[PDB]
Design an enzyme around this catalytic site. Structure first.
Site, PDB file in Angstrom:
ATOM      1  N   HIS B  41      75.178  10.984  14.972  1.00 53.76           N
ATOM      2  CA  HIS B  41      74.627  11.088  13.627  1.00 53.76           C
ATOM      3  C   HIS B  41      73.227  11.716  13.599  1.00 53.76           C
ATOM      4  CE1 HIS B  41      71.933   7.588  13.370  1.00 53.76           C
ATOM      5  NE2 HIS B  41      72.896   6.772  13.793  1.00 53.76           N
ATOM      6  N   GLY B 143      64.540   5.227  12.875  1.00 50.91           N
ATOM      7  CA  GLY B 143      64.046   5.941  14.040  1.00 50.91           C
ATOM      8  C   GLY B 143      64.438   5.269  15.349  1.00 50.91           C
ATOM      9  N   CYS B 145      67.525   4.447  16.320  1.00 56.23           N
ATOM     10  CA  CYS B 145      68.841   4.843  16.835  1.00 56.23           C
ATOM     11  C   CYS B 145      68.727   5.579  18.151  1.00 56.23           C
ATOM     12  CB  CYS B 145      69.616   5.650  15.806  1.00 56.23           C
ATOM     13  SG  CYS B 145      69.993   4.722  14.300  1.00 56.23           S
TER      14      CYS B 145
END
EC number: 3.4.19.12
Lengths: 304, 304
Positions: B41, B143, B145
């Protein structure tokens, strides 16, 4: 979202851990530049700990008696000296992994991370606090002495604690990196009892702010209080008296959530007087006091 | 003595964290050998997350669109591919700090450490567990991830988790390092609700053994139970059914303390039925389930 008991990344400190052996005793040392810092009780046997005369025991030790090993490589000891309750072993090689560092003596209520080590090798990292009675509630087995506590500000490690002993009640005592014990504790195996383990009020309030930010708000109420009224309740429950300095430190969290500090004090007062009624706050069934206001802001904003 | 929620030393993993930017999205990547692993993603905008077609979005990306930075140094991307929900960015330089590693897919009930990062920079480390509903209860902001979960066995890091999302209820979901989500979760911003967050019974029993070893024994009683009788109580309290496999895994802790597993089950049964009556066990006012039997043995013996 979410709020966890978080320790600082331990890499910078892992690169400083060495093993120190003197005679039959092995513990951990901290290698910064060309100096290795370790508890002076590395020169003691289990018998010596009952009533040690450190200056006298140290006369019988020479540089070659201090075996310092960094991983599999031996370090050459070219000098040794005792500073309060720590030994400083000068080695011929500066630690190439020495981070930017400072030695700080923390106040009760402040938190830090501990890198628990055995034989100079790191085993784990956890977050704890200097209790108001100057003990810490750590996880230390035999061989963990010399493990250190620290905080990190971007690239600078501030070392604040070195582990030296376990009291007969299972709590821990140690020194700053200048070798001065926190509180009244001594490096002698004697009857040393800890005082009242009071609760760090400002940290509980900061954690209640973290709970509101992260969605847990059931404990918010329609009440307010004053510093003096709240402190009557704090006294009754063995909580530290809240000062105007603590209120000011909570200013940023109060501004972020829109909840006045004294309104949060009234929520805390109700929680103390009525308990949590089988409910939880941030996955805890008790009022957590080992997050400072700075820790809450840091975690809630993602400081690296 | 003492028992703390301990994370593994994070140094070996800190040396693998990089920043990955694609367009306007920045998250973390894991750099092992000449491959950087990150959530797929990273190619999405906040709008794309509502209903993303990853294969279609990826057609519009070239190697030069993936900006990978390790500290202040830029990495050259020479290939990219999607494996389930992770992207593998082949870079022209092997990470010189690549530790010995394995990719493992953990079972619910198992614990691991998370190194929470932002912009490729580590912020903190904490210990958590794969819940029986395949969520984790972490501390992750925007932030984070690409931050990873891992276990260490001496010098080998077993990576088990990569963070991908936060459900609307504040719990977290992610994948193993092959890109397969734990549980039924998907990398789409949709109504994804978690199932029952049952309690990991074998971990609570292991933690009760840790409590006895470390001095907290008030909950020991004169009773015993059977696996079937205990499981009638476990069902009522949303605890996982205890199996003979769990009893066998608790064998070493039972041998060390001299407390039969079924006697500890009877202590746990009384704690479930009567509560803790305002008392604590290892500083907790609830039954802790994020220490496995292996974690208890490791911490109680000082494995490095």
């Amino acid at each position: 979202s979410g709020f966890r008991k978080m320790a600082f990344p331990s890499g910078k400190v892992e690169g400083c851990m060495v093993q120190v052996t003197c005679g039959t005793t092995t513990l951990n040392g901290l290698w910064l530049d060309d100096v290795v810092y370790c508890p002076r009780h590395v020169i003691c046997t289990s018998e010596d700990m009952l009533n040690p005369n450190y200056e006298d025991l140290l006369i019988r030790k020479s540089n070659h008696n201090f075996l310092v090993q960094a991983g599999n490589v031996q370090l050459r000891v070219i000098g040794h000296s005792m500073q309060n309750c720590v030994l400083k072993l000068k080695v011929d090689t500066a630690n190439p992994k020495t981070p930017k560092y400072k030695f700080v003596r923390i106040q009760p209520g402040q938190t830090f991370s501990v890198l628990a080590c055995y034989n100079g090798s790191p085993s784990g990292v956890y977050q704890c606090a200097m209790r108001p009675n100057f003990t810490i509630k750590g996880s230390f087995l035999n061989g963990s002495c010399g493990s250190v506590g620290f905080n990190i500000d971007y690239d600078c490690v501030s070392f604040c604690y070195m582990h030296h002993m376990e009291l007969p009640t299972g709590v821990h005592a140690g020194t700053d990196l200048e070798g001065n014990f926190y509180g009244p504790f001594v490096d002698r195996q004697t009857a040393q009892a800890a005082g009242t383990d009071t609760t760090i009020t400002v940290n509980v309030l900061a954690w209640l702010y973290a709970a509101v930010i992260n969605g847990d708000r059931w404990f918010l109420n329609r009440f307010t209080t004053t510093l003096n009224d709240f402190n009557l309740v704090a006294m009754k429950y063995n909580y530290e008296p809240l000062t105007q300095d603590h209120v000011d430190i909570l200013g940023p969290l109060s501004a972020q959530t829109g909840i006045a500090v004294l309104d949060m004090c009234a929520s805390l007062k109700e929680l103390l007087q009525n308990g949590m009624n089988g409910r939880t706050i941030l996955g805890s069934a008790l009022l957590e006091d080992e997050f400072t206001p700075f820790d809450v802001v840091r975690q809630c904003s993602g400081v690296t």
